[PDB]
From a paper:
To neutralize chemokines, ticks secrete small cysteine-rich chemokine-binding proteins in their saliva with no homologues in mammals, termed Evasins. In contrast to the highly selective Evasin-1, its homologue [name] binds ∼20 CC-chemokines with nanomolar affinity. Among this broad range of chemokines, the chemokine CC-motif ligand 5 ([name], also known as RANTES) is of particular interest, because it is one of the most expressed chemokines by activated platelets and plays a prominent role in the development of atherosclerosis. Thus, [name] binds to the [name] monomer and causes disruption of the [name] dimer by shifting the monomer/dimer equilibrium toward the monomeric form of the chemokine and not by direct replacing of [name] from the dimer.
In the present study, the structure of [name] was determined by X-ray crystallography. The [name] structure consists of eight β-strands and one short α-helix and has an L-shaped topology with the N- and C-terminal subdomains oriented orthogonally. Superposition of all six polypeptide chains of the three [name] crystal forms showed that the rigid [name] protein core is flanked by two more flexible protrusions. The first protrusion is formed by the N-terminal region (Glu16–Leu25) plus the loop β3–β4 (Ser48–Thr51) that extend from the N-terminal β-sheet. The second protrusion extends from the C-terminal β-sheet and consist of the loop β5–β6 (Asp68–Tyr82), including the α-helix (Ala74–Gln77). Residues Glu1–Glu15 are unresolved in all three crystal forms as a result of high flexibility. The crystal packing reveals a large intermolecular interface of 2,380 Å2 buried surface area common to all three [name] crystal forms. This interface involves the N-terminal region of [name] that forms an extended intermolecular antiparallel β-sheet, predominantly involving strand β1 next to strands β3 and β4 of each molecule. However, size-exclusion chromatography (SEC) and multiangle light scattering (MALS) analysis in solution show that [name] is a monomer, indicating that the packing in the crystal may not be physiologically relevant. In addition, the six independent structures of [name], arising from three different crystal forms we report here, are very similar to each other, suggesting that the crystal packing does not have major consequences on the overall structure of [name].
Residue numbers in the entry:
A (entry chain A): 18 to 72, 79 to 104
B (entry chain B): 18 to 104
Write the structure that this text describes.
Protein backbone atom coordinates (compact mmCIF):
# COMPACT_ATOMS: atom_id res chain seq x y z
CA UNK A 1 0.00 0.00 0.00
CA UNK A 2 1.66 2.96 1.61
CA UNK A 3 1.48 1.27 5.07
CA UNK A 4 1.79 -2.44 4.16
CA UNK A 5 3.95 -4.94 5.95
CA UNK A 6 5.12 -8.06 4.11
CA UNK A 7 3.26 -11.18 5.37
CA UNK A 8 4.93 -14.59 5.57
CA UNK A 9 2.67 -17.54 6.30
CA UNK A 10 4.24 -20.71 7.73
CA UNK A 11 2.51 -24.02 8.32
CA UNK A 12 2.57 -26.07 11.49
CA UNK A 13 0.92 -29.03 13.19
CA UNK A 14 -1.50 -28.16 16.01
CA UNK A 15 -0.85 -29.77 19.38
CA UNK A 16 -1.60 -29.47 23.06
CA UNK A 17 1.92 -28.05 23.42
CA UNK A 18 1.53 -25.39 20.71
CA UNK A 19 2.37 -25.18 17.03
CA UNK A 20 4.89 -27.86 16.05
CA UNK A 21 7.54 -27.92 13.34
CA UNK A 22 8.06 -31.32 11.61
CA UNK A 23 10.73 -33.85 12.69
CA UNK A 24 13.11 -32.35 10.11
CA UNK A 25 12.73 -28.87 11.67
CA UNK A 26 11.92 -27.41 8.23
CA UNK A 27 8.65 -25.48 7.89
CA UNK A 28 6.86 -24.77 4.60
CA UNK A 29 6.16 -21.04 4.14
CA UNK A 30 4.72 -18.74 1.52
CA UNK A 31 5.30 -15.10 0.73
CA UNK A 32 2.76 -13.24 -1.38
CA UNK A 33 4.56 -14.74 -4.41
CA UNK A 34 6.37 -18.04 -3.71
CA UNK A 35 6.54 -21.27 -1.66
CA UNK A 36 9.77 -22.23 0.15
CA UNK A 37 11.07 -23.93 3.30
CA UNK A 38 12.70 -22.31 6.31
CA UNK A 39 14.70 -24.09 9.00
CA UNK A 40 13.23 -23.80 12.51
CA UNK A 41 15.29 -22.07 15.20
CA UNK A 42 17.13 -24.16 17.75
CA UNK A 43 14.87 -25.20 20.63
CA UNK A 44 11.63 -24.61 18.73
CA UNK A 45 8.98 -27.23 19.49
CA UNK A 46 8.91 -30.02 16.87
CA UNK A 47 7.07 -33.29 16.25
CA UNK A 48 9.05 -36.46 17.04
CA UNK A 49 6.40 -39.14 16.44
CA UNK A 50 2.69 -39.47 15.68
CA UNK A 51 0.93 -42.44 17.26
CA UNK A 52 -1.19 -43.30 14.18
CA UNK A 53 -4.00 -45.82 14.14
CA UNK A 54 -4.55 -48.40 11.41
CA UNK A 55 -8.00 -47.71 10.00
CA UNK A 56 -10.52 -37.80 11.50
CA UNK A 57 -9.47 -37.37 15.16
CA UNK A 58 -6.54 -36.20 17.31
CA UNK A 59 -3.72 -38.65 17.93
CA UNK A 60 -1.18 -38.91 20.72
CA UNK A 61 2.15 -37.54 19.55
CA UNK A 62 5.53 -36.98 21.11
CA UNK A 63 7.12 -33.53 21.02
CA UNK A 64 10.81 -32.57 21.01
CA UNK A 65 12.97 -29.47 20.37
CA UNK A 66 14.96 -28.55 17.29
CA UNK A 67 18.68 -29.18 17.60
CA UNK A 68 20.76 -28.14 14.57
CA UNK A 69 18.00 -28.73 12.05
CA UNK A 70 16.65 -31.98 13.43
CA UNK A 71 14.06 -32.72 16.10
CA UNK A 72 15.58 -34.10 19.32
CA UNK A 73 14.19 -35.68 22.49
CA UNK A 74 13.63 -36.35 25.32
CA UNK A 75 9.95 -36.49 24.37
CA UNK A 76 7.01 -34.74 25.93
CA UNK A 77 3.54 -36.30 25.58
CA UNK A 78 0.95 -34.28 23.65
CA UNK A 79 -2.12 -34.73 21.42
CA UNK A 80 -1.80 -33.53 17.80
CA UNK A 81 -4.43 -32.73 15.16
CA UNK B 1 -10.59 -30.33 8.42
CA UNK B 2 -8.12 -32.60 10.16
CA UNK B 3 -6.16 -32.60 6.90
CA UNK B 4 -5.28 -28.89 7.23
CA UNK B 5 -2.10 -27.59 8.73
CA UNK B 6 -2.23 -24.63 11.09
CA UNK B 7 -1.10 -21.39 9.37
CA UNK B 8 0.73 -18.67 11.24
CA UNK B 9 1.18 -15.40 9.40
CA UNK B 10 3.82 -12.94 10.65
CA UNK B 11 4.46 -9.44 9.40
CA UNK B 12 7.83 -7.98 8.37
CA UNK B 13 9.49 -5.02 6.69
CA UNK B 14 10.69 -5.89 3.22
CA UNK B 15 14.22 -5.00 2.05
CA UNK B 16 16.93 -5.85 -0.47
CA UNK B 17 18.23 -8.24 2.21
CA UNK B 18 14.87 -9.97 2.71
CA UNK B 19 12.16 -9.78 5.37
CA UNK B 20 13.24 -7.84 8.48
CA UNK B 21 12.21 -7.99 12.13
CA UNK B 22 12.30 -4.67 14.13
CA UNK B 23 15.14 -3.63 16.49
CA UNK B 24 13.49 -5.42 19.41
CA UNK B 25 13.41 -8.73 17.50
CA UNK B 26 9.69 -9.25 18.14
CA UNK B 27 7.13 -9.58 15.34
CA UNK B 28 3.37 -9.42 15.04
CA UNK B 29 1.75 -12.73 14.13
CA UNK B 30 -1.78 -13.98 13.50
CA UNK B 31 -3.14 -17.48 14.15
CA UNK B 32 -6.86 -17.80 13.21
CA UNK B 33 -8.46 -14.89 15.07
CA UNK B 34 -5.60 -14.33 17.55
CA UNK B 35 -3.09 -11.51 17.11
CA UNK B 36 0.08 -11.72 19.17
CA UNK B 37 3.80 -10.98 19.31
CA UNK B 38 6.45 -13.62 18.85
CA UNK B 39 10.15 -13.27 19.51
CA UNK B 40 12.28 -13.58 16.43
CA UNK B 41 14.84 -16.42 16.43
CA UNK B 42 18.49 -15.76 17.03
CA UNK B 43 20.29 -14.63 13.86
CA UNK B 44 17.09 -13.46 12.07
CA UNK B 45 17.66 -10.35 9.96
CA UNK B 46 16.42 -7.19 11.71
CA UNK B 47 16.50 -3.40 11.51
CA UNK B 48 19.27 -2.06 13.80
CA UNK B 49 17.51 1.19 14.54
CA UNK B 50 14.53 3.46 13.81
CA UNK B 51 14.51 3.75 10.02
CA UNK B 52 11.47 4.91 8.01
CA UNK B 53 10.36 7.04 5.12
CA UNK B 54 9.04 10.28 6.52
CA UNK B 55 5.37 10.75 5.83
CA UNK B 56 6.05 14.12 4.09
CA UNK B 57 8.33 12.55 1.46
CA UNK B 58 5.68 10.07 0.24
CA UNK B 59 4.75 10.45 -3.45
CA UNK B 60 5.01 6.81 -4.70
CA UNK B 61 3.54 3.44 -3.86
CA UNK B 62 5.98 1.26 -1.91
CA UNK B 63 8.41 4.18 -1.96
CA UNK B 64 11.79 2.81 -0.83
CA UNK B 65 14.09 4.19 1.86
CA UNK B 66 17.58 3.70 3.26
CA UNK B 67 17.88 1.19 6.13
CA UNK B 68 20.47 -0.74 8.15
CA UNK B 69 20.25 -4.46 8.78
CA UNK B 70 21.69 -6.48 11.67
CA UNK B 71 20.85 -9.87 13.18
CA UNK B 72 18.82 -10.83 16.23
CA UNK B 73 20.94 -11.66 19.31
CA UNK B 74 19.01 -12.52 22.48
CA UNK B 75 16.04 -10.36 21.58
CA UNK B 76 17.98 -7.32 20.36
CA UNK B 77 19.20 -6.42 16.85
CA UNK B 78 23.03 -6.57 16.79
CA UNK B 79 25.76 -5.80 14.29
CA UNK B 80 27.70 -5.99 12.22
CA UNK B 81 25.53 -3.78 9.96
CA UNK B 82 24.66 -4.24 6.33
CA UNK B 83 23.39 -1.51 4.02
CA UNK B 84 19.91 -2.12 2.57
CA UNK B 85 16.99 -0.46 0.84
CA UNK B 86 13.65 -1.04 2.60
CA UNK B 87 10.13 -0.52 1.31
Amino acid sequence: DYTAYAPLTCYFTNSTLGLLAPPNCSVLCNSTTTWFNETSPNNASCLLTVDFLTQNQPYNCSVGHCDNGTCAGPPRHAQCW
